Amino acid sequence: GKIFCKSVSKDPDFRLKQIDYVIPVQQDRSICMNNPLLDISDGFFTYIHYEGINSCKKSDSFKVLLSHGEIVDRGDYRPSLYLLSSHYHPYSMQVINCVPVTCNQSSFVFCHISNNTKTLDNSDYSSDEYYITYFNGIDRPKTKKIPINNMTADNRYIHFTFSGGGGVCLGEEFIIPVTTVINTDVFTHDYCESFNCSVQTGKSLKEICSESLRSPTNSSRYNLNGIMIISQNNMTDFKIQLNGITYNKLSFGSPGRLSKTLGQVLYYQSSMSWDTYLKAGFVEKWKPFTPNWMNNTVISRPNQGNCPRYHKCPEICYGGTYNDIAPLDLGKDMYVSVILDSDQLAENPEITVFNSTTILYKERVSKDELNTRSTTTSCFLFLDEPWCISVLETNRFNGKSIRPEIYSYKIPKYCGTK
Amino acid sequence: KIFCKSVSKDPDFRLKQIDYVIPVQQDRSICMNNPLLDISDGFFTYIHYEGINSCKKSDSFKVLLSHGEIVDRGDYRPSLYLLSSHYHPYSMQVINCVPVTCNQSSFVFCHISNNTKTLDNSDYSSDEYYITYFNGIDRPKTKKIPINNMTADNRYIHFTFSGGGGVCLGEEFIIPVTTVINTDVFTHDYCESFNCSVQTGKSLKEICSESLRSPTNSSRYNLNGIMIISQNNMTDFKIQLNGITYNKLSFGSPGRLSKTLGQVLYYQSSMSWDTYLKAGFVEKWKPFTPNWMNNTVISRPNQGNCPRYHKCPEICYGGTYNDIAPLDLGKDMYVSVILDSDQLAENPEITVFNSTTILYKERVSKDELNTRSTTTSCFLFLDEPWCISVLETNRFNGKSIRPEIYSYKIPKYCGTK
């Protein structure tokens, strides 16, 4: 049950093991496999990553891999990823973003397809297309176009993309994290405006906070996080709804995540603006999409520029890294996450089990310096014990091909064992 | 318009074999089989299958796709320049492929299935169909065909791209296809009109209805046709599947569409009772109506109850694929590498012929040579008509079997040796 280390300690034994047989190995050294995504649910997972030529940008990719698989016991006393099906996205050369959801022991991929890589800066969603690609271990993949024409929205959104590290299945409804674009300032910022930081001499805090939500490449557009709820009758009569995130503690649009864990629904939002601390919380209401935001004072992320690690004050900033979290104990408010132990550079990944107020324990992945652009983590019960699987967007071989890495580890049964 | 157009002996085709295009496998167990070649606008697309200790089409672990160019080497003859060579990403599941060279690039239309007998017990919704396309510089890319948005003129239950080549017309691709349907929706005035001995078992109407059945599924019928694929620069595909005319129906078989001499030529291999050349230029596209020739001299060998030159309707299956290529539209002249044997697949001969008479011919090899099918494409080179043919040869005994490419010229003058 809930018998594991719940105290501050050193030298944890995560029994860390790398998994190499899941992610394919590309023969071309010039191809960069980037932006991995992984979502685990009910013993099955969905893995996604992008392949590009001499460039690791997501939409700048000629192939997008979609893998479905299962968690299997090999008598090893630890979970193994068993790859069942592997297909390439039929519209890979036009993929702007994708989000994985493992529903009913099957894989579902929600992607945004466009002819224009800059569609989010100069276009609208009527000019683009959105698809659901779904398959499992036996059935051939089928791709259905999402009828955004028949979509209902809670605000005057002009654009949107599925952006995040994973989604959620609730009954007949899919709930996918999404980033929307709107061209008017309809927002309030009590949280940002309440900070007592030095006021920069050009503008005031209300202006600073309004403008910090703007797109950095279209001074006229604003990026707001939200969710998309898609209900349907066995791929029939789609009903699509687009709801924005709560205006309490707004942060610039960024890839998020929804996860089914411990009887709860956990929302995560990558911190790509001035508030560099963990934005995460369990879902209270669905309209408006209100996650109960944490007061985490120990988990941050690196970034260059005016908002490095542990930066708090409001400032017109853009940049950051995606680092999923996974809850371990609801009563003790414990979570685990692979974060980057650096102030400005994206390197030195560390498995970190933490409080909202204190870091409980941590361990470096590699003894040598390791480049890591993003991490995702999912935890689950296996043989009545808590195990976790993380995917790291690594670049250990600089100059050669890039390929993410998968690690499996266990929450320590006892504290301080080495 | 200046070449031999009369009956003559001892023609000088200036025949030369090409060996550097098709790879040579070091492994003796590999069968290189079912070659396909399509030439268009000075570029070609070659395809063949590789299997282990078996030369069967779906029994193949590798499928080679080659793109190339016709180049003058100062040799006073065309040379094949191999540009790109790739293996199909789904080779172990390929049931059939058809090549099309469009806009100086290669396009391969393939049918992929888990079941090598999918045509006997499955349907096309259970399978997948792809277009693999590439040229000399770009990496090959494979796109899935959206058969969900396809419109058909009849209740077809299955289909495979089957043939030696397709055709590019503007923005539309026209690929030969063989369809499967489980109800007899056909008429047979042509077969029923034959004045042959009545078989003691069945009547001529039954003989002709049943001869269209699959020989491995008494409940299914195989009907030839075409597939028209229009698109907006690989976007918003519009796919249409039209069947061949019911005039002079013959059992489903690999065909061909070729752009030659300002016309579009359709060929159908004779795998049923009508053992003579099935070919003709396309009049209408819906229904797919080729103006069938009345050829009395070109046939093909086969074992069993329908050998070479058999005419009478009979429930027969078997035959060889032998492309033709037109040389002169006004003189109704054609060239083809046919098999000079009554029942065995051997002794290939380059044959220039009329619809009613054989003009001249030449054996490819002095020794006996095994050849299961031939394909031929002709084109203008240096203001002269030249042709290139590919034969799935077995020159060594058994072992490493590999096709061969030959280039030859239509004789400028008659009877020169």
Place this chain on the structure above:
Amino acid sequence: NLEPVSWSSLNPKFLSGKGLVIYPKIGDKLDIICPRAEAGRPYEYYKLYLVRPEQAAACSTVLDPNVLVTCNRPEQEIRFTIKFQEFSPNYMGLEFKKHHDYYITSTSNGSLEGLENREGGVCRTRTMKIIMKVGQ
């Protein structure tokens, strides 16, 4: 590690015509310190853009160039660490790779009035451009 580059009009490493050229190898660190409050109180405010060679010659930036780092605070020693790895925590990826060129400039007027002036500025007046040809 490399010698950090203080970004101020009072730095000699900015050659009057060639800017400041650096030949860093992969895996090198490089700080870009924007200056503290100088002794003589000459408040220095800039806004740095990651740019392309053509518009680095023309010294103009459109909306697409991303504000790499801005020298907002005069008192706080604002800085900018760079490791020439491929993956970077910046918006728009910014892959470094090897044997490429990477140009960093500012189009701003010396003070905060022209902080977001993108037309001309220091790129041509003082030629304070950092050019990094990795490799060689």
